[PDB]
Amino acid sequence: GEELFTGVVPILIELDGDVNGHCFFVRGEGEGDATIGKLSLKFIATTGKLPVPWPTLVTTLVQAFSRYPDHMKRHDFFKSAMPEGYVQERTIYFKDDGTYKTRAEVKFEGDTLVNRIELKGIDFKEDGNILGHKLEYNFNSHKVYITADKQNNGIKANFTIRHNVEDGSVQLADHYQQNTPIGDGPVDDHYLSTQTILSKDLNEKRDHMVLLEYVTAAGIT
């Protein structure tokens, strides 16, 4: 699957959501450089104003795009499942607040890699950090601990995301993940190091998130 990631690969992102009854849609376009672990994307809300903070959707809207080191090439499930693709599911627990359930498909559509997502948010508190938009427009660096999931012939990941709040302490989001192959069966413990930058397109009147991310793999000597 490594052969399809050579050079620059186009990216398409689609998300459908419902948070405490609030529907919304997001569309993103950009490109990815798996060889260099670089992502550049621009997101727009096609339904108006986003009812939840943009940082909370960062993890939900890819991962093939990670640069796995030469001695770790065989451990990249994300790239190995292409072009057929894989299904990615999560339950995100915001401490003392609501929860997100997500289901996505990542696959090639022509020469474009597409990520179509469905998320449902429930039990979010009124005037909370999420529904109250009290989260800073930024993102911290994290470690995505990946482990094999023999039963589903895929992988599982666990990590806690730290969302900066406008005053000083931070809002935690526990992430639980499962990735499963879509077709024919081509596949150790390790982790991903992530860095993200959120920004704004000054000539865009629509709600915008501009994204730059750098991801590498490690954990094996």
- Residues in touch with Mg ion (CB under 5 A): 16, 18, 23
Residue 18 or 136 having the CB closest to Mg ion: 18
Stretch touching a second copy by CB under 8 A, among 15-23, 54-62, 99-107, 174-182: 15-23
Q: Pick from Mg ion, a second copy, none: which does 20 bind, CB < 5 to 8 A by kind?
A: a second copy
Q: Return d(Cα 113, Cα 125) in angstroms, integer.
A: 35
Member of 2, 4, 8, 22 binding a second copy (CB under 8 A): 22
Q: Which of 51, 41, 25 is closest to 118 using CA atoms?
A: 25
Q: Where are the beta strands (DSSP E) in the chain?
A: 9-19, 22-33, 38-45, 86-94, 99-109, 112-122, 142-149, 154-164, 170-181, 190-199, 208-218
Q: Does 16 bind a second copy (CB under 8 A)?
A: yes
The DSSP letter of residue 80 is H
Stretch touching a second copy by CB under 8 A, among 13-21, 34-42, 100-108, 128-136: 13-21
Q: Does 139 bind a second copy (CB under 8 A)?
A: no
- In the bound complex, what is the minimum distance in angstroms from residue 90's beta carbon to a second copy? 21
Locate 197 and state its tokens: 């930058």
Helix (H) or strand (E) holding 78: helix 77-80
Q: Does 23 bind a second copy (CB under 8 A)?
A: yes
Residue 16 or 33 having the CB closest to a second copy: 16
Q: Pick from a second copy, Mg ion, none: which does 7 bind, CB < 5 to 8 A by kind?
A: none
Show Cβ contacts of residue 150 under 8 Å, excluding neighbours closer than 6 positions. Answer: none
